[PDB]
Symmetry: D2
Subunit: 373 residues, 4 copies
Amino acid sequence: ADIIIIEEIPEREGLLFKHANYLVKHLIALPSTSPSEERTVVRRYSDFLWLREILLKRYPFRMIPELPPKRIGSQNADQLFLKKRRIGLSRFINLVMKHPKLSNDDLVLTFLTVRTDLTSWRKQATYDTSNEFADKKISQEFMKMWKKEFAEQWNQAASCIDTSMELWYRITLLLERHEKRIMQMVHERNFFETLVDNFSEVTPKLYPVQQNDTILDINNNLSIIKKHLETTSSICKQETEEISGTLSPKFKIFTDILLSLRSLFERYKIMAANNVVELQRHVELNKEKLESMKGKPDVSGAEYDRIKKIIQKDRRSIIEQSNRAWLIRQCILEEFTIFQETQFLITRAFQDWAKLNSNHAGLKLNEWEKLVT
Amino acid sequence: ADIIIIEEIPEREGLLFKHANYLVKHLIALPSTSPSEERTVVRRYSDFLWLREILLKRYPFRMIPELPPKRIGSQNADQLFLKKRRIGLSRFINLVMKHPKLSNDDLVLTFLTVRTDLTSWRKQATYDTSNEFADKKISQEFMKMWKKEFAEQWNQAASCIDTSMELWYRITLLLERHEKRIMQMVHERNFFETLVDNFSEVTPKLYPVQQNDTILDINNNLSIIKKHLETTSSICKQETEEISGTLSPKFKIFTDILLSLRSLFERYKIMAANNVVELQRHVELNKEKLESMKGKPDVSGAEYDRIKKIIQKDRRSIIEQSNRAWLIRQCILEEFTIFQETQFLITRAFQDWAKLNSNHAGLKLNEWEKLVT
Amino acid sequence: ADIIIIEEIPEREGLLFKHANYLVKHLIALPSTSPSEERTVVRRYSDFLWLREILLKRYPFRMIPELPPKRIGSQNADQLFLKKRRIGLSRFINLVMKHPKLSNDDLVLTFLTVRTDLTSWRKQATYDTSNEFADKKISQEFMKMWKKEFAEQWNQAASCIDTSMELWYRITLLLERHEKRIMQMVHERNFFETLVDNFSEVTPKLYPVQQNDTILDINNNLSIIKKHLETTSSICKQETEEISGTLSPKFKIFTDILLSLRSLFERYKIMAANNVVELQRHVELNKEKLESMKGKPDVSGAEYDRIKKIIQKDRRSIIEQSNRAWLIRQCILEEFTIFQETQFLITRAFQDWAKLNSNHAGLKLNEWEKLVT
Amino acid sequence: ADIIIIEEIPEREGLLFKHANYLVKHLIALPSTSPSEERTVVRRYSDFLWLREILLKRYPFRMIPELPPKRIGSQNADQLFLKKRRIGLSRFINLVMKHPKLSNDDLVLTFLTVRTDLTSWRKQATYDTSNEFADKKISQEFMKMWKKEFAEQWNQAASCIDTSMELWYRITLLLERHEKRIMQMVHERNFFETLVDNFSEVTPKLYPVQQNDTILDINNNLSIIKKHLETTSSICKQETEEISGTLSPKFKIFTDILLSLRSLFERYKIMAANNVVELQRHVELNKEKLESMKGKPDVSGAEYDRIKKIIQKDRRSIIEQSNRAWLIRQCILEEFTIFQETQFLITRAFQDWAKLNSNHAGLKLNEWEKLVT
């Protein structure tokens, strides 16, 4: 559902700043709600915050996109830190969409197909039906690879992701810098046009006309050149806006899925820390229960009942933690899936990069050789 | 005589700074001294100062190139303000050479063909033989155009030259700026290569290999891209050094002949100010001598002899100033000649500009399309 | 235990980069290990990583300082991104120390008092004794304020902390910028000294001495001024290094405790999400068990035993989750404590700021008025 | 006659640019025209160009101020390159005024006391009465010092002036840079005020009020600090505008008299080049006339009359050139006078510099120590 979020509209512009109302333009192919012709919904940045928090509460250990930068920032006045917000926002929701469990979620579509305001929804909020997977499900192969190799597998990814996140950030930064470079270049290029026009006009005043005529030939060649520079600068700017504005998402989506897996491994490490403590209790109880086999020799109902309660609560504990451990690792793999899709995504990124650079260079070469005449 | 001045050598480098000894490499076609195979002479920046001052003293109202910036500047320590000095110096002397009267001058060739030091020359300095043209020469048409149109003609050039000097300076400045731009670009391009190499290396650590192999395909594509960027940056730098270093003189020579005509019109205005005062005396004496025709009625030998001395000295004065006025205007025209050569020089400048930009763009397009594969 | 970590030493410097060995200089007042005279221990950045991870595993919902930026960064070659690492590292450990539970922890002191390498420690790692607080402890007032006002209380802090984190970051950024400003200023100030010396030396060459002597008075006044500028620039640089280098931590510590509470509320929200799901199960089971009171009318041992297992496991569940909920909120308050210490810390920050600015301005005023003479 | 030229007015502002009409505000103490109460005259930049050219034509080898930068520049659109023009213009005319011969000139006062337009003046232009000093005047000591020491004296100044011109230019540049520095500083200072206000407002939201009250004390201290920064930034800006705007001329006047003596030595070298050629003819005729003393032995009226004409015209030539040589050197000295006034001018410059820096530092110290409370 490649949906677009453009024409963000707060209450009308002034000194102040308000939290814009974003038109969620449901360009729809997913049949959760049957694919509409189009059905816009007005929703806010606060609405998308509610959205993400609810996603986080319902679906743990699943891919989750970033947020747009904060609205309670120091000074978020001008339109830049709102345009970035809308482009990011589009990327964020649409990323939610390509992801499987979210595209199938109930919460998302209700967030999509709704015409009233947030409060009426709050009446039927009722996310109590939408919470943690407490159900035991039988893995076909209860031992596929979840610790034989996958443990070290994503243990290595845990660090490689921060490394590669810095890397890819620097890379798309470099592309943005190339773009601002070329925009400065077209600036001074039009300045150059101004100069060559003034120079054409001050060639006769400096080079006699009524005596020599070739000057007219040459300061008409310079008119050829001012027109060349006009066209060259225009197509520079065209490359800037079209090419780079539509190239940047092709890069940024990788960054966002990367830091989404960052968030994921953070949540995972700090919650599977519970299984860490539980395995430490595993060894602790192994030890205390092997020392327990003194036969319980003294006739003591107190010791009997106390350590019976101990072992029984610990037994239901170990079974529930094993249930939870497998139920976690499975979702880890479910996320590894679309991460291996991001794999091919980097391919798409670099190939589009080279292609559009080639288009730009081709037009520029054609312009140059055209000028040489 | 396209002579080159490279390998400027002061006493050896240290904290201090000395006035380098410039190897004047007489790549010679002018037969003043018969065209040598090559004959280097060691000469200093001070030597070229002596040169220019002597030229100025001997030949007034003739094209004269600039000097290199000052050696008694505030801080002229590092090699930049000496390399600019040597390139400028080459331009300055070689410009002296293409100019007719200088190429025919005696002073210049002696400055060229000499093997001793400056002092022995100072012994035979003897520039008393080389001074102002005091001789009357008969203009064929004593009225060609020297005031009917040429007066206003170069009166207009007097201002157009400062205008066009600023213009052309800005233009060649813009080219230098384009060059420094592209050098910064190749800087960050090699940084980009570093990044993509690190990214290739952290793709497997983040994208499983023993499971998925396509990652090897893609991070070998990125090796293709790092090699592309290596070649692209190398040829960027090649364009920088070769193209722009050998393009800049093609521009700067126009600037130097322009400010040479600037110097010329300065000297001319401030010395023909003498003819200005002389024409004011012309009208003053016209008036006083028409009032003089009272017949000199009183019998007075004092008044007779005094106003006779007046009229006779004023008569030799008016004839000598007319001699000088025509003898000046003629040299004005002699300079207008090579200025009308600079006319075609701007043509050469812009055409070479476009051509070498086209070469660069062509190589870059070939690199891009080669990469797309 | 205001301990210092200076003279970070990797294997010797070269092209490469290694993970320095940090001398933990136990300037000790805490008697966990009795206050030593001093006892340095060599430990690495990797060692401090092991440290922090272990802290995180053992003590949840407690103040925890940041890490230094990553060692697997893109290009961390030069010494800047290692000096920042050592200053940060000192701040990080020493912050661990002022915090109560950490200062009392067993893990930390062993990390401190140890002379062998990390591996021998790994033999006696034995952090199984050091894990999650599973014990029930009786809050004196089991209802102090943990939801009547404290819920909204830190709910508001949840957002105010990101706001104030941006703010305080900008503020200490501004101070660093002021410092770099003044360093650039002392740069051009010494350039100014160079200029005025050259100007003194070229005053006589331009202002006749053998005629006029007052020039000696004035170019000795300028010697007074060059000496003034020498002293002024020196004390500028002194203010830079001393004042700002020792002022910056006074600011940064607030930023680090702020983002420590950031990390805390992150962990807390995403783990108390478990209590969120548990309270949703609370309402769900309230509902299903009120619907359950059909008397269990049909004679069915299956339904009887199944819903008996349901209610019993849910009952032990609700008691364990209430135990955990209170056991969490208590640690929340324990952290609120030192946060209310950071309160006065901002006071210390601003007062030291103003004071050292005043010292600098005072010295500068004294220098100026001293110069006026 | 410290006259001021403010409220430059072209035809009203638009896209275009016109040559403003400058109100010459005759704050008059010189009685050439008796000191008026005040008498404004409207005059243009073109009018001042006519002025300077006329001065140059009438008075050679006398101090002459610069022009304002060119009006036919490439792009002189915005008001900066007109405000600099008006400040420069004021400096230029007022410098003309402090100079003796100009203050006594007839041309200047007519340029001052005039109410019609430039054309009516052009009717009575009549500068034929105002031209070169052709009169012989008897130097009391015909040998004061004009070559015994003054020759080398200003020969040395010829180069020292370009050196010191670069120096003093760099110096006043450095002051302008200090000013722009402090303006950027007050910019970020007011940004800092914005930050500390937002920080005060987000201290309670982050630091509990209903529990802890000291936060009110501290975020009222920060109100003290925001007011401090308000006042500090305001007085920073006051120092900027008042101090530096009124300090800069105190520096620039030295630069302008310096490059005025630059122009002077240029004119002098290139016109006394005539006396150079005349002294070369002096030695040439000494030689040819000593060789002439063959007695004129052959009976030849042709040779007799020809070399008699030679010697007689050369004799009147040598007497007229000696007249001119002394008449030049005298004006050289007349200019050396006010140059030795510029001597004390540099004193005034540096002393005012130090004083106003001291005022600024004093106010800033008072503000700081006031804040410490």
